[PDB]
Symmetry: C2
Subunit: 334 residues, 2 copies
């Protein structure tokens, strides 16, 4: 069941925007003869020393090492180039191309989506609602870097002493955008373990996470300090991390840095950091997903459509050995 | 006489600005992804159909046939 429903969903997603919708980037080598910033990474392109690639078709200006990290097709990157040259409206237009492609695909090849529904034995209404889901996985998901982020503050090592105890009572704040959260406090320790997780939302790969370590002062001094400084808990150090260094899941330790007028700093902080730009990483190796698809389709054709009779395919050449089915089913598996 | 004075003058011109003063154009191929006009001929650069060359060092945007 699990694989069958997973493959149903991945077949619906695979064919609602068939990969045959996509366009290739015609890159020229282009010298950034003035300091320029890559439309993928926003990183420096400069002189012959750091040349870029300029697409013609997508127009798009990037590192060589970025011209492939520019992930979306030449329609979509012609749109994103147009937004980075000036016309943002092109992006909404090619979101509407993505919509129109999927509407045309549905309206012109409804039998693909119906056959996936029948082969996977799903109902027409529930197929319409999982189709809302995979439409949304390419139509809400038409241009998105709306990352949920899940920052486990794990531990620190070698922290500066600041305490009422003579050690520290280290806790941590995490911040992403304007939003700010904290760990509880490890008390009397310069090598603390928290393992404490903060969910955040980021909408921009050029954002930063900020992570800051604080000695928890709950005393008349901190009650006075709260009237003059925001950070009433003697600061033990920070790390700051670009959202584009993040992907999927991470578990990393970072040396600590100063901030406030009260700063004396040493050591490092370990952060686990998940980032839910992550999707179907749950792939059965796509072999197995294809097999599930193929077996379901084969039984459906031979048994369900053909009452156990093997209809020999809408096949071509000796390469009938590669055309297992009629167009609709063949295009499904292909 | 004629050649001697001609060559005197052309030697003076050749070496007052010695050709060893000069710098080479580091051209990249560059798509004029919008209608653009060549810094040599002012002629149309457009799309993949009429690509240009953009130098980095001289920066300069031109036809290939103009670079």
């Amino acid at each position: 069941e699990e694989l069958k429903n997973h493959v149903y969903k991945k077949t619906l997603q695979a064919l609602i925007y068939p990969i045959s919708c996509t366009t290739p980037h015609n890159f020229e080598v282009w010298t950034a003869t003035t300091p320029t910033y890559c439309y993928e990474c926003e990183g420096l392109l400069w002189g012959i020393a750091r040349q870029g690639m300029r697409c013609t078709e997508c127009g798009v200006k990037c590192h060589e090492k970025c011209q492939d990290l520019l992930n979306a097709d030449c329609l979509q990157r012609a749109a994103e180039k147009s937004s980075k040259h000036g016309a943002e409206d092109r992006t909404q237009n090619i979101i509407m191309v993505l919509k129109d492609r999927m509407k045309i695909r549905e309206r012109n090849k409804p039998e693909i989506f119906e056959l996936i529904q029948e082969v996977f034995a799903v109902t027409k209404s529930a197929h319409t609602q999982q189709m809302k889901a995979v439409k949304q996985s390419v139509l809400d998901g038409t241009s998105k870097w709306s990352a949920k982020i899940s920052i486990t503050v794990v531990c620190a090592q070698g922290l500066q002493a600041k305490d009422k105890t003579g050690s520290s009572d280290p806790y941590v704040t995490v911040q992403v955008g304007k939003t700010k959260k904290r760990t509880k406090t490890i008390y009397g320790n310069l090598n603390p373990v928290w393992e404490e997780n903060f969910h955040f939302e980021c909408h921009n790969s050029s954002d930063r996470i900020k992570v800051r370590v604080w000695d928890e002062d709950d005393d008349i001094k901190s009650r006075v300090k709260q009237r003059f400084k925001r950070e009433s808990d003697d600061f033990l150090g920070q790390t700051i991390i670009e959202v584009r260094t993040l992907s999927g899941e991470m578990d990393v330790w970072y040396n600590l840095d100063k901030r406030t007028d009260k700063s004396a700093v040493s050591g490092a902080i370990r952060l686990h950091i998940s980032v839910e730009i992550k999707g179907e990483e749950k792939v059965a190796p796509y072999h197995v997903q294809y097999t599930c698809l193929h077996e379901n389709l084969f039984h459906f054709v031979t048994d369900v459509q053909n009452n156990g009779v093997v209809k020999i395919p809408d096949a071509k050449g000796d390469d009938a050995w590669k055309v297992y089915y009629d167009e609709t089913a063949q295009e499904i598996v292909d």
